[PDB]
Design a protein around this ligand. Structure first.
Ligand SMILES: [Fe+3]
Ligand SMILES: [Fe+3]
Ligand SMILES: [Fe+3]
Ligand SMILES: [Zn+2]
Ligand SMILES: [Zn+2]
Ligand SMILES: [Zn+2]
Ligand SMILES: [Zn+2]
Ligand SMILES: [Zn+2]
Lengths: 172, 172, 172, 172, 172, 172
């Protein structure tokens, strides 16, 4: 046992490692979307910038979970970061819907992690999750939902000017 | 074929995708080392900071390779980022030796990529590799070799003060 | 032979003169597009400004090639700058497609020039081409491809608001 | 007929297109002279800089004529820019004499254009010519005459120090 | 073998050591010229300053090659720096011609070194040579050719005012 | 005889030329030590920086001596700069001991030169030596002796942390 470990269940450690992997995977998916929108035949610079920012924020979230794991004396065990489920995201609207789904799944994983921390009576872990990940996830999901709503109302993807003007105005 | 693609062989595209994956893997390995040195029972803050910086630089290298792939009209195809070969790096000296080996392998991959670009007469790709990756790799390998040499001479790992003072002076 | 001439093949000199002419011709074509978009019945100020900037950059490229020719002791031999293949570019999208084709042809000529310099073992000439023209051409071709993609998706030229809003947002 | 066109004769439009071509040709001749003086075996940096400045000013004059053509609703029709009558300008004094002759011919063409505008009672065109081109040409011709006079008195070209010290003092 | 050595042929190491010696020798020759022009019976302060600057730049080039040798894990092997071919450079024009010849020979050695690096497929070495030495050599040879042209046409050395005024104007 | 020469014996001129050569040789030896400590398997950055500074100071000393030679109307006669007695300096302590020996030998040569200037009653030369070289040599020898003493007491070379911490603290 780590000299610093206290009130840190093994299941919480495993859940934190899994969450680390999931945040790294979300960072990778956002990197994939940024790459897709930097394509010459997509060429939506602000979509690419937005998703690159999301990828960097996901990487920061994973690093914060790593710091938490070390703080509590748990041991980080890294897994393979699976490739994103696709390379062609096919539109700004589809990319935003997939990002919304990804943020909802990351939020569900964080909610399950908070439930586990609550069951194991790990108040520091619960507080960490709710302070640094749950509110961030709710804000991110709301922002992604707003983006999806606006893109759909604009007529995306069929309305060709829709994604371009959303890129300039909302994301630019 | 991409509207922008010109003098960009398919083998060069595949090699660039593989290099993207390798740079992402190196970033992941450096993140693993940073996590290891942030452990309470390792507690080498400057080793962790140095390897986190290496991880971020590797991620930037992968991002620049993907920007190159999009610039040339190639399509980025992301693969699984394999987990690092180990989670316990066991010492500052061992971590530096593994980082040296990783940078040498990344440099070897970049050299093979430059050879491929030369064979396909892709001067832009060759020049890009040279200006942004080969000199960086040579500098990184030299810095890692210096770190390893200094740690060895200081008596790392068995000289307990060696890694601590190297952390303070060289990496701090 | 020039007192400064060294490792500068006659074919390299001729290729550099031809490239000078081609860059001057591209500058002239971009001037033609700028003139077209300054027309009262086209009236796309940012398209005109963008293509005038391209014309000035092309003139700078030709002047840099002339400076290179004098640096290496070759003699600049100027030819007629042929008129652009048309005076009516008929749309922002068509002008962007023609600019993309022109930059691709300039890049192809630069690639052939780099191949010639490589065959004649003129490393300074190869390095000059790849440092100052190849990366610039790749960036320009990518930017033009992005412009063309965005204009096409916006519905240009048929979508009358497409070129106007692209002029304001992307080019303004 | 252009929506903006009024009191703009077809002959004025053709004369403006011809003047555009002539100004582009003068810019090209000045570029040739700048290139000649950048030669290693001529090596008069201030002569080259002076003639490059003349080339850029000629290009600006051509661009202003194009702006005038579009302002009046005339259509710019670009022609081949003929190569300068020679590549070897053989001296600072000879280059200055050729520049003087070129500016006198450009001024003669501008005077014929002003006569045409006067005959067709195009007061805006006459005023444009006289405010932006005639005074500029008179000043340029006077400056070139001064340069030629000083170079001749200094003993150019046979006086070896003459062109060097003129380059340093007058043009530097 | 050095821990950092990778894709660094022994012939490249030997060629780099020879180039180091040649750059040190060129620095020594430039120091000799600076000394000659600081003589009371020569007394060309700007010629001496120019050649001292050349000597310092040559020493910097040798030091950069030394840094490259250490970066690649090659071992620097210093040789005797041969005395310059003469102590009396006899004139500003003769010194400039000898400097031109020396820079051309250094450039030839660098070109052979780049050819060797190309044959050994050492892209980092080729890139290093071309980015830091080949363009510098071309610029230096062009500047020296310009100096020689101006001095010759000013009447140097027989025209006694020629070297003095070149010292004041071009070199001052 | 030089027009400026006065009270400047031929033996003093020869001794000054020999001192030129000796200072250039010391600069070369210090460059060799700097190169040795920049090696990846030595990797003592501050030792390398210190010895590079010593090399540059030795070059400045030689340059000052040749300025003195020209000031007095003597003629500088440069000789071969012999390669340093070794390429492998094997240690920070050994390099410091060799630097101490080299500074002591340079000081002995300067003392013999001052004795010669005294015998020839050349008060300006004696004053120059004592003002610019003797005090500098005494300070340098004392600093090198301090460095050697501290390295020996620290346990260099066998104490592996000794040279590293001396590099950080004294030389950093
Ligand atoms: Fe300490
Ligand atoms: Fe809008
Ligand atoms: Fe003067
Ligand atoms: Zn990398
Ligand atoms: Zn170009
Ligand atoms: Zn004009
Ligand atoms: Zn050099
Ligand atoms: Zn000294």
């Amino acid at each position: 046992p780590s000299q610093v470990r206290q009130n840190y269940h093994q299941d919480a450690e495993a859940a934190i490692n899994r969450q680390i992997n999931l945040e790294l995977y979300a960072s990778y998916v956002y990197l994939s979307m940024s790459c897709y929108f930097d394509r010459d035949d997509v060429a939506l610079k602000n979509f690419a910038k937005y998703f690159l920012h999301q990828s960097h924020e996901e990487r920061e979230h994973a690093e914060k979970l790593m710091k938490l794991q070390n703080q509590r004396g748990g041991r980080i065990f890294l897994q393979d970061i699976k490739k994103p489920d696709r390379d062609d995201w096919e539109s700004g609207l589809n990319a935003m819907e997939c990002a919304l789904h990804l943020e909802k799944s990351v939020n569900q994983s964080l909610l399950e992690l908070h439930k586990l921390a609550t069951d194991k009576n790990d108040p520091h872990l619960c507080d960490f999750i709710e302070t640094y990940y749950l509110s961030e996830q709710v804000k991110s999901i709301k922002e992604l939902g707003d983006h999806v709503t606006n893109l759909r109302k604009m007529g995306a993807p069929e309305a060709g000017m829709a994604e371009y003007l959303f890129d300039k105005h909302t994301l630019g």
